[PDB]
Amino acid sequence: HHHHHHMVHITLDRNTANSWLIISKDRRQVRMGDTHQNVSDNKERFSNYPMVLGAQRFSSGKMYWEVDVTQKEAWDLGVCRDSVQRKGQFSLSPENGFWTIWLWQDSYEAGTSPQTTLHIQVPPCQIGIFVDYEAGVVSFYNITDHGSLIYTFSECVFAGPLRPFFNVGFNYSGGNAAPLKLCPL
């Protein structure tokens, strides 16, 4: 792809994080802690899952960023509406305001309803995410495999400002402690 020139500098919003997450000083990395991280509760925090939003809000234009997923067993990545539900149980779908892909149990899937199987020959260590607000497109790229396309959501109905979306996943296995990292431009 040739989307690299739309690169944006994403930082994580500490106030939206699940209370078990640990965000680095530079706000560019996030991992699952082994306990509650001693923060107060607020209406922004994702309560049920290890999720956090980017600070940046997008309502126009073309945006591109990259995320490092090295050695993780499970994660979700993409964008979501600013007004997504924070509390309780929900599914990641465009009807609920999410445009996402994930890794789970050794398979990659796009967060459609129902979910769509992805076809990845080279397990990615870094993911590229491209949003074209006006066109209604969210695309995912395999940086490890020379930028090959993973998935395109088209005909997106954003219906609001968008935020970068992250889920570091649970670590029930002891094999999913590694962080998500925003990669340098």
Ligand SMILES: COC(=O)[C@@H]1C[C@@H](O)CN1C(=O)c1ccco1
């Ligand atoms: C890009 O490849 C990966 O991230 C793979 C996917 C999954 O099989 C876990 N994994 C590891 O490499 C890993 C987990 C713990 C130590 O290494």
